[PDB]
């Protein structure tokens, strides 16, 4: 219900570790999947943001867990955020002209078109 609604806060999967029959294991692998999905996206989202802000809505427990987890993903390789590489690429969609490369072979489309007539 929560996951479909998009209230990640409400999930009851980052607290479904404590009550378990032997469920705790399954809950943990599923949790890791949830954390990743958000983690890649956030990079694109914004530039160099606080460590504390980057633990909060990254579903992390401590800045130590964030450092190791962020590093594999490609942000916070050091002790300083590196969100900035990823973020800048996304925002301008209407700027890019390698020209000939981008045109993508005008010749082919033309040739398809001409043949019928």
């Amino acid at each position: 219900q929560y996951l479909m609604e998009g209230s990640y806060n409400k999930v009851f999967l980052a607290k479904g570790n404590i009550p378990a029959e032997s469920y705790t294991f399954f809950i943990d692998i599923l949790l890791d999947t949830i954390r990743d999905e958000i983690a890649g996206c956030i990079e694109k989202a914004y530039e160099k943001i606080l460590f504390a802000e980057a633990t909060r809505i990254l579903f992390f427990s401590t800045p130590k867990k964030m450092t190791d987890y962020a590093k594999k993903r490609g942000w916070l390789l050091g002790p300083n955020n590196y969100y900035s590489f990823a973020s800048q690429q996304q925002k301008p969609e209407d700027s890019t002209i390698p020209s000939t490369e981008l045109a993508r072979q005008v010749i082919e489309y033309a040739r398809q078109l001409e043949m019928i007539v």
Partner: protein, 155 residues
Amino acid sequence: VIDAFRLINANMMVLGHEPRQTTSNLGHLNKPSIQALIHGLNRHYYSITINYRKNELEQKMLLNLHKKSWMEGLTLQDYSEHCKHNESVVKEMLELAKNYNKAVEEEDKMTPEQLAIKNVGKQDPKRHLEEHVDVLMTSNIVQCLAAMLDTVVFK
């Protein structure tokens, strides 16, 4: 229209008659309309046919064009000229578009010529719009093909 003939002898006509020239050959006898031409033919000569000699080599000479035509097609048609054509095509299309719109309300019957009288004028308004779309298409085809093609090859 050109003809070849052969003279016929006076003694030949009386005894032989003119169909004797016709034997052991093609035997086509020409009529070059009526009037003086035909009348004079009959009183004077026998006309016989023309064939053309040809050879493969002879053809090959004729067919030959230009070195320059090689680049001609390639040539990147100016945007300016293209734009003139593009403007010309959209304006005719708009005028016809209306006609097209009224036309489709009817036309439940086959026979496209009847639809042409109804929609008014020779040929259907659907066909008029296509004719214009096609002319633009031809200009466009040389330009776009040429545009990429030129840049890559000289580069």
